[PDB]
Scaffold this active site. Sequence first.
Site, short mmCIF file in Angstrom:
data_model
loop_
_atom_site.label_atom_id
_atom_site.label_comp_id
_atom_site.label_asym_id
_atom_site.label_seq_id
_atom_site.Cartn_x
_atom_site.Cartn_y
_atom_site.Cartn_z
N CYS A 137 0.82 -1.22 0.00
CA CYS A 137 0.00 0.00 0.00
C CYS A 137 0.85 1.27 0.00
CB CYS A 137 -0.90 0.02 1.20
SG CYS A 137 -2.40 0.99 0.95
N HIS A 138 0.73 2.07 1.06
CA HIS A 138 1.52 3.29 1.18
C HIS A 138 2.85 2.97 1.88
CE1 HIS A 138 -2.47 5.08 0.50
NE2 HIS A 138 -1.77 6.03 -0.09
N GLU A 169 -5.83 7.52 -5.03
CA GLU A 169 -5.94 8.70 -4.17
C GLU A 169 -7.05 9.61 -4.71
OE1 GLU A 169 -2.33 7.74 -1.87
OE2 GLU A 169 -4.42 8.35 -1.65
#
Lengths: 236, 236
Positions: A137-138, A169
Amino acid sequence: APKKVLLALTSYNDVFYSDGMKTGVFVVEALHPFNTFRKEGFEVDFVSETGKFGWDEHSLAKDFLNGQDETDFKNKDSDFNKTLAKIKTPKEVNADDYQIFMASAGHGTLFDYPKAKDLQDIASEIYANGGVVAAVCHGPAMFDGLTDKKTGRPLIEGKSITGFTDVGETIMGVDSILKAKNLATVEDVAKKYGAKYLAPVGPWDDYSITDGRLVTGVNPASAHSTAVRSIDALKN
Amino acid sequence: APKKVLLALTSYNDVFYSDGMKTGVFVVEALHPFNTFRKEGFEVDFVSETGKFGWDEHSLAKDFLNGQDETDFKNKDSDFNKTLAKIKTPKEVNADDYQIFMASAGHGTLFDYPKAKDLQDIASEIYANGGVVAAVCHGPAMFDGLTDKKTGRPLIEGKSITGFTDVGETIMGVDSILKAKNLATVEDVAKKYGAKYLAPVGPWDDYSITDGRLVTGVNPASAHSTAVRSIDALKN
């Protein structure tokens, strides 16, 4: 020989979404990798910059937390919760104890991972020892400033990785929030440090990449695959 | 630079498997991409080294060919069959008429794609014109000798791709056949021409990669995704 994994969690837990809800650790990004590693006989130690963490509130919804996961999450006596209770601080970590460094995520990581020098040092050591560095993910946000001790260059320079998409996003409408808070997306980080970003067909697809001993995943749906790849990459 | 796709098929159609069955074009590797391109408004022209082809006999099984696919396959009046009937030879092809070059596969490609100089020139021209080059399964065999007109270097050099796995060949017990026939695997080709091979978690998983305008997929299960990717990549 005990196979150990250091599973990093974001230490950021505060109001984030336009609905007033807080971000933090995306539950399954910590739980699925945990389950995958434990299933293969690995021991798992959690860690965060502060030794503390909070759950991303959107990840608590039934759509993201259900069935056995929800049961383990609610059971204070589950292996998961008992291990989380023993979460370490970077200082309490002995890098040489691990074969895999896995960075779980949630949007919280955009706040602390880039500046988590101590965790980056640990990840760098684990990689230098021939281990695997993974992020989902991030999670790749922690690659911002992560140096390969062998070359002295960014660990991801010249590597192929994936991670949360810019379009994701935008679809979630948090793009305006990231800009307002001066946060960099995963694709921003990849571009800045010379990594080749390879995207999934769709932003929520289970999608992951293994480039040698550097493993990455795109989102919550990719947490399991990312963990599986990190185990397989131990032969690289 | 019209909105058309050139779908390459292997011209090899001979006994290949231990059970005495022949290889050739893996049905869904031609059909799924065909459907996807047509759905998006693209015109499709089929082509092979000889202008002729044969179906991989194992790909005719119910597990690989069924439902609507099996219906369109059996319907002589299906848009699919009608287009297949107009299959061209490389000489009849005009590279400037396509935005996408798509190399379908089946093991047969290992015999003719590496030597298909005329098809590679066409693919090179399509790519030089800003188009997309895609390949699924053993389709990357087409990259053996494929040059980038812009640099004179192998088109896949420095690029990240995926394709049929070596482990998949072993599991199928066809590895001994490739050795006896002096054939190179997709991973062999990537290694030979300086490409970075990124593997799927499992040999039969739907897995694909988009590296700019170079798109690749691992197997039959990945044919649809590979086609979808080639279309989205026209903007890269």
